[PDB]
Design a protein around this ligand. Structure first.
Ligand SMILES: Nc1nc2c(ncn2[C@@H]2O[C@H](COP(=O)(O)OP(=O)(O)O[C@H]3O[C@H](CO)[C@@H](O)[C@H](O)[C@@H]3O)[C@@H](O)[C@H]2O)c(=O)[nH]1
Ligand SMILES: Nc1nc2c(ncn2[C@@H]2O[C@H](COP(=O)(O)OP(=O)(O)O[C@H]3O[C@H](CO)[C@@H](O)[C@H](O)[C@@H]3O)[C@@H](O)[C@H]2O)c(=O)[nH]1
Ligand SMILES: [Mg+2]
Ligand SMILES: [Mg+2]
Ligand code: NA
Lengths: 187, 187
């Protein structure tokens, strides 16, 4: 995978809703040897996720909704607990995530803290994910956050044992709770 | 709660599989609502962080990832915790084999953290997460080609730094590094 990446072919395998490409690239080695590779690349655009936490109560806000992709893959009920999250669409990550937060969780969020931007599945998915945390309070609650999306308010400690047992099993939701833990913000 | 799969359509089956799934969802009323969702299925995998308590080092890898190349990773090169796809193998057999091919270590004992969905929007993938201690006495070769992957050993203080500089920017690697920290085995 060293150096010299010549792009050779970008074929669209499927462009219904999101896009599936087949990508042909060449890697050229130290000696000048050229090896051809072919890789499916699925482009659903980038996303952002936020973790709402509160230091007055030691609580965090998450959601739960039906994820069909997990229903077809081992998740019996299909419902999944997760940090609030949205696709970028036409929006910068901040705008994206503020709106996402107020549609899904019904909180008007103020100061945010960006953590990192991570690829979640870099083998075959372009998806970059913008991570945020922000503190919440009862003042910031505009509405209810309704889709089958249920808003969960629970102890930070509870959420942590749910990672332990399997009740929480989403990746971006685990990163975020683990970062809040290591941040000390909740102590 | 009540879920019925109506139609599973194959949009692409060139190598991996892209499905367009129609399902009925019964609401908090008894209300039936129909959805269509693209679901990409590349199977599942397993990833392993290798750590040495004596040297306080970790082992990670650097390879080219086309999925990131087309979405913001200039050189396409990406640092990740060793991983492989399941290929009908059990997570532990998989990751044991992944470790020798990619890192050159026949790791002895192995610990299982959890299984997480990495991108539950439209990707099926479930990753099995691992850690295990390593030593030179476990090495045999220096990374082969199942590929030409590069093997980075580095100070575990540096790896954490790189997550903050965004030099490390892969979902499964951050988790792995973050969990190890929280676990304290490195103090
Ligand atoms: N027909 C159709 N509609 C879709 C599809 N995917 C999304 N939609 C529409 O878009 C909505 C989803 O909006 P978001 O809240 O932005 O999507 P999300 O699933 O929460 O996405 C976030 O989390 C994912 C899981 O990690 C991330 O992968 C993603 O980037 C994003 O951050 C759905 O209610 C639906 O109307 C699809 O495959 N087919
Ligand atoms: N033609 C073709 N071949 C492929 C494709 N994807 C993989 N292969 C073949 O399978 C090999 C992949 O090596 P693995 O170590 O088994 O998988 P990985 O690419 O490291 O994937 C791991 O990381 C991904 C990203 O986090 C994970 O999504 C995946 O589950 C796995 O754990 C490649 O060298 C290649 O020969 C594809 O889209 N097309
Ligand atoms: Mg959402
Ligand atoms: Mg690999
Ligand atoms: Na496209």
């Amino acid at each position: 995978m060293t150096q010299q990446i010549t792009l050779i072919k970008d074929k669209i395998l499927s462009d219904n809703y999101f896009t599936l490409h087949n990508i042909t690239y060449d890697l050229t080695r130290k000696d000048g040897e050229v090896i051809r590779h072919k890789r499916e690349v699925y482009d659903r655009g980038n996303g952002a996720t936020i973790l709402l936490y509160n230091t007055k109560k030691k609580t965090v806000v998450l959601i739960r909704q039906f994820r069909v992709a997990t229903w077809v893959n081992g998740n019996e009920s299909g419902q999944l607990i997760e940090s609030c999250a949205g696709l970028l669409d036409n929006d910068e990550p901040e705008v994206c995530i503020r709106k996402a937060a107020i549609e899904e969780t019904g909180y008007e969020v103020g100061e945010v803290r960006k953590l990192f931007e991570l690829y979640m599945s870099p083998g075959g998915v372009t998806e970059l994910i913008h991570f945020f945390i922000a503190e919440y309070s009862d003042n910031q609650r505009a509405n209810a956050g309704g889709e089958d999306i249920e808003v969960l308010e629970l102890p930070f400690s509870q959420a942590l044992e749910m990672i332990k047992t399997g009740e929480i099993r989403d990746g971006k939701t685990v990163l975020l709770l683990n970062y809040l833990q290591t941040s000390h913000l909740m102590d």
